[PDB]
Amino acid sequence: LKKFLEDIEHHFEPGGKHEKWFALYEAAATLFYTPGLVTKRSSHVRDSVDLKRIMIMVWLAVFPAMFWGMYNAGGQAIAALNHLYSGDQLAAIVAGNWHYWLTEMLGGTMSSDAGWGSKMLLGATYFLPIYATVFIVGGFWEVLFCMVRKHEVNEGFFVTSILFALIVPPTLPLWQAALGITFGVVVAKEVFGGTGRNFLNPALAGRAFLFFAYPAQISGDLVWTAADGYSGATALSQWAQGGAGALINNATGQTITWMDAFIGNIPGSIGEVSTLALMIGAAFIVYMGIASWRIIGGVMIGMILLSTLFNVIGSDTNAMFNMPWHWHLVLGGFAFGMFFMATDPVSASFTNSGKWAYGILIGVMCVLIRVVNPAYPEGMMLAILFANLFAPLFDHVVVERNIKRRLARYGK
Template sequence: MKAWLRSVNESIKPKFMPGGAQAKWFPIYDAIENFIFSSTHKTTNPIHVRDSIDIQRIMVIVWLAAFPAMFFGMYNIGNQTLEYLTLVGSANTNDWHHVLINLVGYTNDSFISKMWIGAVYFVPIYAVTFAVGILWEILFAVVRKHEINEGLFVSSILFALSCPPDLPLWQAAMGITFGIVIGKEVFGGTGKNFLNPALTGRAFLYFAYPSQLSGDKVWIAGLSDTGITPEGFSGATPLGYAAEGGLQGLTDNFSWLDAFLGNIPG
């Protein structure tokens, strides 16, 4: 199968090379080729360190490294949302997310339900972020006639993870657009920018739409729909318990698992 794919690739490759009929689309072809196949360029000079790592693999590894945070974030969105719905005695928050959620249904104490609710909120934001970001990357790669850089994998997931769950999708598109275009491409692209595209886009949204990016309602999905404001938390911090009762005082109030998962305040 791999040999057949390689032969098909080699047969169409001349069309995308300089002078070929589809030469202007070479960046897109190159991105697909690099995604499917490993590089054929190998180091032969003995003074170089030989390794299979290249920028594509590095970016993909960093992208995959963000997955645990992504999955926990989805779980936490679902966990907080179901706790909120139980508190207000509501079956849903009357927005389009719950049209999708109700297609599968949910129960308040189900891990799968919490993951599903979190995915319904997070995945659309990430999908829009990635789609808009890759369009800008392709556009600049075609115009400048260079390869599409895999850094978008990292920028897109970091940007999406930094956004609140109720973020309108058009704002996600605007944010990543600002981050890619103003934060990176205007300086010449990857390696020439001094701003982080993901954080640049996030900062743009924060200052452009502060009421929807900060405050006491944006981090629990659906909280803004009913006008209920969560009460603040007041109490001793884990260090306070430890100072009063030592390790025993700490473990009497919190478990190590709670500390690891981030389910405790302070």
């Protein structure tokens, strides 16, 4: 590969043809092989870390959540299908859905005796097409801007593509996934100059676009389980209706315990369900210093304080008032947003003091939307997007206090 990559560089050079594809060919060469660049001036030595390794660490950090998500997505769907149909009726349903008979063809079974392999396989049939569509469509916009503007491709899109695919319902139509990533990549990032030069979270901007443009496909009772003809409310929606007592899984008929939500054995977005899986990945990137623990700490502080305040105030009518902090933690997309989306460094505050305020605002807003906004059962995406708008302001307040300390010579 090394010899082939080096030799073909002549063609992609300005003298040779296909120069318009240099930004993509050089990306492949640099992607496979680290460049042989040496420092040109001081510092003559550099840290081993680079943008490529940072993104891959985040990309790997969500793998455990992604793998469980596929397993959970298949499990929820298979359970619902058997709870709704049986016998030849199930066979017709399986025959009328390419997700179902493709799983049968590859060795899985849609029967209730299905093991983890068939459930994970079935969940893959939903996740992979979404991820492939998001990667290809979003990657096309990335290369187009780089090619036209003569920029080198940036590796930040790897995190955006995977995260966006893991925050959508399993049943999301592909054509809507293409539009969602297109809005997030283009409107939120590229027109600002690409990775590191924007202010809004790209993946959440794409989800918000679908959230407000096609609400029927990303809300309600028909999108969070991939069993055709099945209707089931998620835990957050159920709590808003009848409190903790309403937390029931109709497909399986079993009550939803805190442990169930914690492990991720609940309907929802593929990737968000398992708080345990997200914590495992979040621990690594936080330990590695890639994700800010001040933002994560701030989010927890804001969530616990406001939720406890709602607990004390009480409400005989709004059941969301009595949801405790530890239930807020394991429900919806709070865990996913706090660890892998609130920590987006570009859209977060650039000062350590601001990061605390930035995270606290995120945590406060999520509970607020969850509790006192009837329309939306969850508000993590909206909370983060709202917090992005004010992150530069927290930095400005902190920096202006720094400037006042300096004009006083730090009291020296």
